[PDB]
Structures are given as C-alpha cells and as structure tokens.
C-alpha cells in the first residue's frame, strides 16, 4: 500500500493527524545519486466520521501565518482551544525501529519552503467533494447542513510551524459522502539544480450512522435534519422541551435570522434556573462535547451521545434574533 495511516481517535468524538516537513533534504548516501530536484511522497491520512464528531487536520504553517504568529504569540487562547491543543499537539513521525537504517532562520525555513502553500483560509468551510473532477471547494453546509467549522489557526503560536483546522459532521449526509483537503510546500538540496516540492493529503469518509435526530428546528416544520420542530421562525418566543438519554441524538437549529445562545453550545449550556450560561463541563468535565468554540458560524449545534457516556445534565440551548428580545429554545434533559 501507499504510506497510509488512519487519523488518531481521542475520546468518542475526536480525530486527528498531520503532515510532516523538511523531508527532501536527504543525506549524501542518497543525495549523491540524485539530480534534477526533489519530489513529493505517497503519504495519506484517512478520517472516518460519524454524526457530531470532530475532525482535526494539522499542516505546516504558511509563511503568512508564521509571521503573524510572531506578534500574535503575545495573546492568550481560551480554555477550550487550549484543551484542543492538548488533543492535537502530537506530531506523527513513526520511524518504527530506526536501527542502523536510513530514515523514511525560522522565517528562513518559511522562505526556504518558498512560503508553505497549503489549502488556505477556512480550510474546512470550503471543502472538496471526491464526487467529481471539478473538486469544487463548496460550502461545507451545502453538503452537511448545520455543520460547524473553524477557520484555519496556528497549533501553538510558540511553536509556529503547524496550523490546524476542524469541523463537526451533522446528522445528515448526502448518502456516501467523501471530502478531501491537502497541504503542499517547497524546498531544495545539494544538487546541481536546487529545487524541490512536497505534498500531503487527507481523505474524509463517513460511517453508516446518519439519520434524522431530535432538536426542535427553528426554521421549518419540514426539517431535513430533525424529527421535531418549533412553530414559526421569528417575532415571538416559541420553544420545546425533551427527555433524552445517552445513546440518543439531539440538538438545536437556528435560522439565518437567529443565532445560538449559548454562543458556544454545547460546550456552554443555558441554566434554566438563574437564567445564565454555564459550561457543559461544570459537573461533568469527563465529557464528549460535539461542538467548536472558534467556528465560522454559531447558528447550529447537535450532540451524539454514546452508550458508554457517563454524564447527566438538565440544561437548555436557545436561538435569538437580531432584536435579542427572545428566548426561543429547547430544554435538554439528558439522561434525566
């Protein structure tokens, strides 16, 4: 096979892998036999996603983001993103038993790579289906409505060589759904030509667990996603309440006219009593939480709770309009 790997899995909802760098600058025992430039290698990383889990992809940082890190390092990150870093800080350099065998200026490195050139900007909001040769970078939402997705961001600004992006897969897929993303760069070596290019690629598949779920859709009764809905869209507060359990799937869907409150639901929850936003970790920190604080859109969130989930909580998530004077919501009594 090609140099294939599966992304690492963390908890019951996190998938992660990366691409390596500086690999075409080989030792003389190889280099002296080579001429006319270096080439990319057949490395692949695969994801297999289920509804409401999160995929993380790490790539060499572009020079633009490297230079930005050098001033952004003076700023702090929030706790969720710090926890994410601890999920994804691992580098993948499996040399196995590298025993007597051949292996398999910080901005100068960025320049040396002639400005690393990976997939830019909202790495996972504009996504390529493997459906056809167009490879159109479509809104994730036009394939996976209600999906939650980050911009691409530096792994550790204090180790500003790796950047990453992530997204959350909703309950609904267009049957056999596949996406791909990729990360390229350049370099050079001790030859008579002094040029070289390198690449890495990720293939994203889905498992057979997609279905309509609970959640009280605030756009329409004829929901393509949910088995439940709330009457009307706007102008007056309307709501639902639901008894759900572990091993069941539920959520919250805002319309284009409304946005999530809690802002980072489900990582935050609305406490019915005392009318306030708290964490989905206050009493249950040992928890699979199916969302992303640094998402590009804060309108839709859902949760797929596995049978081995150990948590319990009475809480709510809501949608509010531009007038702000509303609490349109669904009360979630999870494992009530």
């Amino acid at each position, epitope marked *: 096979a090609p140099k294939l790997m599966m992304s690492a899995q963390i908890h019951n909802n996190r998938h992660v892998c990366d691409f390596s760098k500086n690999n075409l600058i080989v030792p003389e025992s190889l280099k002296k036999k080579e001429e006319l430039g270096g080439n990319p290698v057949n490395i692949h990383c695969y994801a297999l996603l289920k509804p409401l889990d999160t995929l993380y992809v790490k790539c060499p940082t572009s020079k633009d983001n490297y230079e930005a890190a*050098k001033v952004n*390092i003076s700023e702090n990150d929030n706790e969720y993103e710090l926890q994410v870093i601890s999920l994804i800080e691992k580098r993948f350099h499996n040399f196995e038993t590298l025993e007597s065998k051949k292996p398999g200026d910080n*901005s100068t490195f960025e320049k040396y790579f002639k400005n690393i050139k990976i997939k830019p900007d909202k790495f996972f909001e504009k996504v390529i289906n493997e459906y056809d040769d167009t490879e159109e970078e479509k809104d994730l939402e036009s394939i996976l409505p209600g999906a939650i997705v980050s911009p691409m961001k530096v792994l550790k600004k*204090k*180790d500003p060589f790796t950047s990453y992006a992530a997204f959350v897969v909703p309950p609904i897929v267009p049957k056999d759904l596949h996406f791909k993303v990729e990360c390229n760069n350049t370099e050079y070596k001790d030859e008579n030509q002094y040029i070289s290019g390198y690449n890495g690629i990720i293939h994203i598949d889905i498992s057979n667990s997609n279905r309509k779920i609970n959640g009280c859709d605030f756009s329409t009764n004829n929901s393509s996603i949910l088995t439940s809905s709330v009457k009307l869209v706007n102008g007056e507060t309307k709501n639902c309440e639901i008894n759900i359990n572990n091993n069941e799937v539920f959520g919250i869907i805002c319309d284009n006219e409304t946005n999530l409150d809690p802002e980072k639901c489900f990582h935050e929850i609305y406490s019915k009593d005392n009318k306030t936003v708290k964490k989905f970790r206050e009493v249950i920190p040992n928890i699979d939480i199916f969302s992303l604080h640094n998402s590009n859109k804060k309108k839709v969130a859902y949760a797929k709770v596995p049978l081995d989930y150990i948590n319990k909580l009475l809480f709510s998530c809501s949608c509010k309009t531009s007038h702000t004077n509303t609490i349109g919501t669904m009360k979630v009594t999870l494992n009530k």
Partner: antibody, heavy 118, light 105 residues
Framework: QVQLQQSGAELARPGASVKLSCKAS????????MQWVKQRPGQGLEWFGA????????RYTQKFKGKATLTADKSSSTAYMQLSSLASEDSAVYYC???????????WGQGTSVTVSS | DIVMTQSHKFMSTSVGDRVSITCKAS??????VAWYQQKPGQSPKLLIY???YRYTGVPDRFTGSGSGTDFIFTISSVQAEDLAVYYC?????????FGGGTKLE
C-alpha cells in the same frame, strides 16, 4: 501578576560552583522560554542560554556551553542556572527573563550577583 | 551568530528633543527585533517588540522602526528620566543576540 524571583547574591571561590534559582509565578511555566542574561560589572547585556521546560530543550551561547547547566523544575515553576569552575570573568549579574520561545523578553527577574574571589 | 551593532556607545540630547538610536543586524532579521531600556541598578525593561510595536504600558514617546537590517529606536520628546542604556536584540535566529547598547545622556 507575572513574577520572577531570583536567589540572593553569591560569593564563590575560584574553581567552585554555584547554583542560581529563578522562581516564576503568575503564568503557565511550560508555555514559555526561561532564559538567562549575563551583565559583567559596567558592561552590556549578554544572552547566556535558555531552557524550554515544556519539553526540556536547552540552548546555550557557545561560549557558555562548557561551564553552565540550565535546568527547570516544572512542579515548582523554578528555573536554575548552575555555573561551574568559576573564574573572575564569571563575576556578573545574572538575570532570568521570560519570553515566548525565541522572542522578546517581557518579564525579568531582579538579578543575582555572583562575585568570584578568594 | 547574528551580530547586532549599535555604532554609538553614547548619545546626548536635551529634555524636549527628539533622539534616534540605530541598530544594524549583520544579516536580515526581518522584524524580529526588540528594544530594552535599562536604568542604573534596575533590570532591563522591554519597550519595543517586533521592531515597531510599543510593548504594554510603554509611554507614547517611545517608538521603533525598521525591517531587515537597519533598526531605529526613537524618543519623540525626551524627558529627564529617560537617561538609560538602550539595547536592541534579535530573535530571528538562535541564539538571540544583543547590541552593545547606547547610553542616553
């Protein structure tokens, strides 16, 4: 609330060793470089070396690699600089300073004076 | 190692004047330069980072400029308490290195 507290002045005989400490508080010790800066009496600043306690990596200016050892205790957020085979050229104030790895030194300790003399 | 040259060990200016201090890198360091102020008996204080940004709480009269090899630290209107030694430092490449300093009188 970021604080770096350095140990007291040292008088040491030539050939002996000394171990200086820099206790950090008010930030995540393992997200930053702790470096040391040497200033001989009346002279300029010399970058001495650094440790990144998060992974243990050390970096020394070449002239100081021979005689100095930099360590860190993560549990106590304390960095240490040990000078061995002391000579008169080692008499100086040594500051510890926080920075992001390879970056600007935003917080400094008050300095520890080392005097080498018989 | 990268050499940072502050060609003037000493610099004189009156209260209320503008003064500029130069620092030249032996190779390109882009914007990876910091400037420090050290007054007698005190630890150095960070004034400018990334060649041209004022550090937190630094008074407005202090600025820095430059990118590549030539860097300038400027006091727009010197105050009497601004006497100190000013040092540039690069962190483009390890090990970090300091300029030799300029004493403002």
């Amino acid at each position: 609330q970021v604080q770096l507290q350095q140990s007291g002045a040292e008088l040491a005989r030539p050939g002996a060793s000394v171990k200086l400490s820099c206790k950090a508080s008010g930030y995540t010790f393992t997200n930053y470089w702790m470096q040391w800066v040497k200033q001989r009496p009346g002279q300029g600043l010399e970058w001495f070396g650094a440790i990144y306690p998060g992974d243990g990596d050390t970096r020394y200016t070449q002239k100081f690699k021979g005689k100095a050892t930099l360590t860190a205790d993560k549990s106590s957020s304390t960095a240490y600089m040990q000078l061995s085979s002391l000579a008169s050229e080692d008499s100086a104030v040594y500051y510890c300073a926080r920075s992001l790895y390879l970056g600007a030194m935003d917080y400094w300790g008050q300095g520890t004076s080392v005097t080498v003399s018989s | 190692d990268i050499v940072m040259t502050q060609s003037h060990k000493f610099m004189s200016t009156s209260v209320g004047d503008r003064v500029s201090i130069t620092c030249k890198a032996s190779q390109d360091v882009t914007n990876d330069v910091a400037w420090y102020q050290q007054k007698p008996g005190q630890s150095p204080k960070l004034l400018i980072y990334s060649a041209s940004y004022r550090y937190t709480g630094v008074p407005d009269r202090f600025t820095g400029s430059g990118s590549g090899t030539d860097f300038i630290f400027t006091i727009s209107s010197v105050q009497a308490e601004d006497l100190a030694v000013y040092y540039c430092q690069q962190h483009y490449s390890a090990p970090p290195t300091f300029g030799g300093g300029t004493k403002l009188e």
